[PDB]
């Protein structure tokens, strides 16, 4: 079974997964599995109630979301959780009539797994939406970095700086929060390293632009050389943001 993708998902699903595995083990053990199971109608109904609620709140997200991919991917998870739930309800019925029911025991395990599995999909789907939001911020900064090439005057540069400053701060904060959430250390490191390189290069870009603007306006020698440092800085930063974008979308083999 796969490692969960973020610390949040892991803290949510890990206890459940653990109890279910415990339940499978008990089931596969003849003497304990063969004992009478008491009436599960009330706890199962409580689970169904909670599934109903989860699905109501889910459908509300569906109608009111911007993300079309979210609209597409969430409903199958609802279906999966509700279907798993009917297995639990059926098990409770069977056991009420026969505490020794074998099919009931199978439904208990299958229903539980189904709820885990579908809740997992639902969480992965919300998580992928969150990542798409981060990526949109990243992509804006990419586009804006292409605009650096047309700053010609000190007044453009102040304006550019006034905008790039915040946008970079926003991306940095988002990436810092996201990396702390990851359960894969290698991914956290790549994110941190890349974001740090981008943070380091930002005042270098501004300098390189100031130098370009100054030599452009002072009609001085070596504007061609200022152009070079400015372009390199935009290229390097962009390469690094595209690497952040690539890493934000990684799921490692132990998840699939």
């Amino acid at each position: 079974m796969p490692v969960f993708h973020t610390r949040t998902i892991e803290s949510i699903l890990e206890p459940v997964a653990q109890q279910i595995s415990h339940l499978v083990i008990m089931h596969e053990e003849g003497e304990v599995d063969g004992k009478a199971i008491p009436d599960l109608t009330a706890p199962v109904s409580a689970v169904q109630a909670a599934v109903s609620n989860l699905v109501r709140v889910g459908k509300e997200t569906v109608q009111t979301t911007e993300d079309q991919i979210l609209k597409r991917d969430m409903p199958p998870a609802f279906i999966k959780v509700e279907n798993a739930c009917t297995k639990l309800v059926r098990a409770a019925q069977m056991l009420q009539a026969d505490p020794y029911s074998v099919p009931a025991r199978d439904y208990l395990i299958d229903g539980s797994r189904g709820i885990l599995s579908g809740t997992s999909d639902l969480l992965l789907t919300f998580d992928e939406a969150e990542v798409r939001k981060i990526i949109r911020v990243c992509k804006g900064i990419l586009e804006y970095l292409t605009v650096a090439e047309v700053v010609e005057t000190m007044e453009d540069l102040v304006t550019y700086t006034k905008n790039l400053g915040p946008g970079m701060t926003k991306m940095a904060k988002m990436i810092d929060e996201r990396q702390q959430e990851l359960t894969h250390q290698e991914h956290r490191v790549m994110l941190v390293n890349s974001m740090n390189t981008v943070k380091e290069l930002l005042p270098v870009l501004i300098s390189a632009m100031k130098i370009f603007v100054t030599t452009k306006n002072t009609k001085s020698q070596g504007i061609e050389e200022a152009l070079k440092n400015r372009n390199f800085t935009v290229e390097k930063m962009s390469a690094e943001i595209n690497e952040i974008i690539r890493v934000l979308q990684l799921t490692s083999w132990d998840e699939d």
């Binding site: 949510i12 339940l23 599960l40 706890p43 709140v57 809740t119 919300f126």
Partner: peptide, 26 residues
């Protein structure tokens, strides 16, 4: 309300496994 619904769902799941004696009997 989204997070509370997960909490509650996995909470009931927890209790149900307990009814099966998961971490209470066996």
């Amino acid at each position: 309300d989204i997070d509370q619904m997960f909490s509650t769902l996995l909470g009931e799941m927890d209790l149900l496994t307990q009814s099966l004696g998961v971490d209470t009997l066996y």
